[PDB]
Design a protein around this ligand. Structure first.
Ligand SMILES: Cc1cn([C@H]2C[C@H](OP(=O)(O)O)[C@@H](COP(=O)(O)O)O2)c(=O)[nH]c1=O
Ligand SMILES: [Ca+2]
Length: 129
C-alpha cells in the first residue's frame, strides 16, 4: 500500500470526511472502523476527535487498500493519515470506534486495528466503559 496526497475540505463525522483527492472533492469513509452516529452515545466525541485530527494536520494522506476504492454510496474507502498518524487506528485506540466492516481484500490493517481495540477495551475507554 502507498500514501497519496489529499487536503481537507470539511469534517463530517467520526468516520467520514470530505477531502480533495486528485483535485476532486470526495467523501471518504474510513476503512475497518465504525464510529457511533452523531446522535448516538460517543458520536459527538468521535466527530470531534476526527475533526481535530484532520484540521490540526499539516499533511493529510489517503491510503487505499487492495480492493474496492469506492463503496456503494460513492464514498472513497481509505486509511487516512494526519501527519503520519492513522486516523482509523487512533479512533479505535481511543475507544471511539469499533473494528468493523472487515471485508475480504480490503483488510490490510485489520490486525493493527484489533490490537488498538484490545488496548482500548483493556483501558475501558469511552465506548468500552
Ligand atoms: C466501511 C465500509 C462501509 N460499507 C457500507 C456497508 C454499510 O452498508 P449499509 O448502509 O447498507 O448498512 C455502510 C455502513 O457505513 P456507515 O457506517 O457509514 O453507515 O457502508 C462498505 O460497503 N464498505 C466499507 O468498507
Ligand atoms: Ca458510523
Amino acid at each position: 500500500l502507498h500514501k497519496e496526497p489529499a487536503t481537507l475540505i470539511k469534517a463530517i463525522d467520526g468516520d467520514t470526511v470530505k477531502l480533495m483527492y486528485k483535485g476532486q472533492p470526495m467523501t471518504f469513509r474510513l476503512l475497518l472502523v465504525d464510529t457511533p452516529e452523531f446522535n448516538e452515545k460517543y458520536g459527538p466525541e468521535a466527530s470531534a476527535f476526527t475533526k481535530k485530527m484532520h484540521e490540526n494536520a499539516k499533511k493529510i494522506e489517503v491510503e487505499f487498500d487492495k480492493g474496492q476504492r469506492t463503496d456503494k454510496y460513492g464514498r472513497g474507502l481509505a486509511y487516512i493519515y494526519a501527519d503520519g498518524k492513522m486516523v482509523n487506528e487512533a479512533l479505535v485506540r481511543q475507544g471511539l470506534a469499533k473494528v468493523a466492516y472487515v471485508y475480504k481484500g480490503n483488510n490490510t490493517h485489520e490486525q493493527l486495528l484489533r490490537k488498538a481495540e484490545a488496548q482500548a477495551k483493556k483501558e475501558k475507554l469511552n465506548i468500552w466503559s
